[PDB]
Amino acid sequence: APVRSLNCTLRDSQQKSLVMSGPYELKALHLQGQDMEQQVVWSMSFVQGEESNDKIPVALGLKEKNLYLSCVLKDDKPTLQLESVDPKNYPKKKMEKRFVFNKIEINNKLEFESAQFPNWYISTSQAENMPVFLGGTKGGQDITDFTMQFVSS
Numbered sequence: 001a002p003v004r005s006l007n008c009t010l011r012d013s014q015q016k017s018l019v020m021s022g023p024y025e026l027k028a029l030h031l032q033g034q035d036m037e038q039q040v041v042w043s044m045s046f047v048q049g050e051e052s053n054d055k056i057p058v059a060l061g062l063k064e065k066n067l068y069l070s071c072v073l074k075d076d077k078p079t080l081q082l083e084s085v086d087p088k089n090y091p092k093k094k095m096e097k098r099f100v101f102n103k104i105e106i107n108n109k110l111e112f113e114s115a116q117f118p119n120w121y122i123s124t125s126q127a128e129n130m131p132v133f134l135g136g137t138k139g140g141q142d143i144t145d146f147t148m149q150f151v152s153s
Contacts (some may be wrong), residue, residue, distance in 0.1 A: 001093055002092070002093060003046070003091045003093045004045070004046050004078050004153075005042075005043045005044060005045045005046070005091065006044050006150065007041060007042065007043055007044075007063055007122065007150070007152075008041070008042050008043065008044055008148045008149055008150050008151060009039055009040070009041055009148075009149045009151060010042065010110075010124065010146045010147070010148055010149070011146060011147055011149070012028060012143045012145065012146050013109055013143055013145045013146065013147070014030075014076075014124075014126070014129070014143055015030065016028040016029055016030050016031075016124060016128075016143075017030070017038075017039040018039060018040045018124075018132060019031070019035070019038045019039055019040060019096045020040055020051070020062075020082075021131065023080055023082075024067075024082040024083070024084075025081075025082065025131055026040065026082065026126040026131065026132040027129055027130060027131055027132065028125070028129075028130045029128050030126050032127065037095045040062060040064040041062065041151055042060055042061065042062060042063060043060075043061050043062070043063045043064075043091070044058050044059075044060055044103075045058060045059040045060075045061070045091045046058055046095065047059050047091075047092075047093055047095045047099075047100060048093050048094050049097075049100055049102075049115060054104060054105055054126075055102045055103070055104055056099070056102070056103045057100050057101070057102055057103070057115060058101055058102075058112075059091060059095045059096075059099045059100060060099075060101060060112075061090070061091060062082075066084060066085050066087035066090060067070045067082050067083065067084060067085075068082070068084070068085055068090070068095075069081070069082060069083075069085055069099070069101070069122070070082070070083035070097055070098045070099055071098050071099075071101075071114040071115075071116045071117055071120070071134055078114065078116075078117040078120045078134050078136065079134055080122060080133050080134040083099075084119075086093075093142055094134065095125065096118050097115055097116050100115035100116070101113060101114060101115060101122065102115055103115075106145070107145075107148055108147070109143045109145035109146060110145065110146045110147065110148055111138075111144055111145055111146075112146075114134060115134075118135070119133055119136060119138070120132040120134050120135065120136045121134070121138055121144040122134065122135075122144070123135035123142045123143060123144045124142065124143045125142060125143070126141065126142070126143065
């Protein structure tokens with residue numbers, strides 16, 4: 001296939017799951033049992049960009065929905081948002097830079113660095129039910145590492 005993808009779920013290192021808050025927002029919270037089904041299922045796409053043996057560029061969209069994570073400036077600050085795209089033209093090998101994240105593997109966890117804003121990572125709060133965001137400080141009060149779970153597609 002042109003653009004290759006794989007379906008997965010993601011949890012932060014504190015075992016919190018991701019769920020869609022509103023129409024264009026994501027939140028992270030400790031979910032277990034039946035609630036599990038609420039979590040977001042992603043279609044991770046391997047797109048074009050500067051690739052390394054530990055840094056792979058990817059795009060993240062919801063499975064079956066024309067919604068992708070995007071990094072943009074909002075009120076003079078790098079910001080993470082869910083963005084609507086034409087369902088006919090996506091996904092594609094050459095995604096716009098704002099949709100691109102560098103998937104990084106350190107210990108056994110994953111980190112997603114914004115290709116648009118270097119050293120800015122997708123992060124979650126230690127607190128419960130807070131919005132998922134773009135953070136410029138790694139290894140601090142906020143969480144920036146995740147594990148990935150494959151789904152039967």
